[PDB]
Structures are given as structure tokens and as C-alpha cells.
């Protein structure tokens, strides 16, 4: 689990969104595994606006933050899971790192701010849904 809190937005994995998220919906995209809802309180996270390919992510199944090198956002085939059939997910970045299903939502960040959230993984890989192109999160 986990979310990004920027301005009056809450960014979560679409597959982990709550009823309150759907009832206060701003935007959602199944192909990216992202959903954004509105919040009453202002958040403290800032979004990175950069082309970093190195950063640090939070892994809840280890209670640890790990430095990683990650690929550029792209269209990647993701195996069937409890939440989606096998399909191509867009704007996804891959790295070598530990992950388990409940690690989705952990933040990946660089020197500029939040880059994205854990969305996929298995067998010593972790994938992150990029948010750096979502310029409207800043206004």
C-alpha cells in the first residue's frame, strides 16, 4: 500500500483504490495502473520533473529504502495477477530490487522529488508507474 500526496491530490495504484477514492475521482488509467482522487488537506510530496534513471524506493516487505537504477518509462508486458489479466502496461519503469504484491504504492524518488510508485514485480524485479509526465499534479 501507499500513496503520493501532492497539493490536493492523492495518487494511488488503481488496483488498490478505495471507495472514497472512486467517489472523489480526478483521473484514472487502467493501462498505467494509476488513479488520482481529491483531498481536503494539502500534501507535502513534490513531483520530480526530470529524466533521472537512478533513485531510491521504499520496500514495505523489507522495511527498507533501496537505491536503484531504473529503465525509462515504456510499454512492458506484465503477467496476469489477481488484479489484471496479462497485458501491456504503459509508462512503466523496471529495476532490479526486491518486491512482493503488497509493496505496491511505495514511493520511488530522486534528487528532484517523487518519480513514481511501485506497481509490478517478481523474481528480483520491481516496476514503477511513472508520474513525471502528469504536469497537472502541480496545479
Ligand X SMILES: COc1ccccc1CCN1C[C@@H](C(N)=O)CC1=O
Instruction: List active site positions.
Output: 15, 33, 104
Among 50, 75, 96, 125, binds Zn ion (CB under 5 A): 50
Instruction: List binding-site positions for Zn(2+).
Output: 50, 52, 110, 112
User: What residues numbered 39-78 form the site for ligand X, per CB under 6 A?
Assistant: 78
H or E stretch at 5: strand 4-13
CB 112 within 8 A of CB 53: no
CA 54 to chain centre: 15
Stretch that binds ligand X, among 4-12, 17-25, 64-72, 113-121 (CB under 6 A): 113-121
State the DSSP string of 68-136: EEBPPSEEEEE---SSS-SEEEEEEEEEE----GGGTTPEEEETTEEEEEEEEEETTEEEEEE-TT-GG
CB closer to ligand X, 9 vs 57: 57
Chain residues binding ligand X by CB under 6 A are 15, 33, 78, 81-84, 89, 99-101, 103-104, 118-122, 126
Which positions lie near Zn ion, rule CB under 5 A? Answer: 48, 50, 52, 110, 112
Amino acid at each position: 500500500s501507499g500513496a503520493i500526496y501532492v497539493g490536493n491530490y492523492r495518487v494511488v495504484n488503481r488496483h488498490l483504490a478505495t471507495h472514497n477514492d472512486w467517489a472523489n475521482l480526478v483521473w484514472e488509467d487502467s493501462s498505467r495502473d494509476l488513479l488520482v482522487s481529491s483531498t481536503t488537506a494539502q500534501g507535502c510530496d513534490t513531483i520530480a520533473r526530470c529524466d533521472c534513471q537512478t533513485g531510491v524506493y521504499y520496500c514495505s516487505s523489507r522495511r527498507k529504502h533501496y537505491p536503484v537504477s531504473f529503465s525509462k518509462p515504456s510499454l512492458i508486458f506484465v503477467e496476469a495477477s489477481e488484479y489484471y489479466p496479462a497485458r501491456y502496461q504503459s509508462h512503466l519503469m523496471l529495476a532490479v530490487g526486491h518486491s512482493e504484491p503488497g509493496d505496491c504504492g511505495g514511493i520511488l524518488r530522486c534528487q528532484h522529488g517523487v518519480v513514481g510508485i511501485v506497481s509490478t514485480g517478481g523474481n528480483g524485479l520491481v516496476g514503477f508507474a511513472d508520474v513525471r509526465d502528469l504536469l497537472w499534479l502541480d496545479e
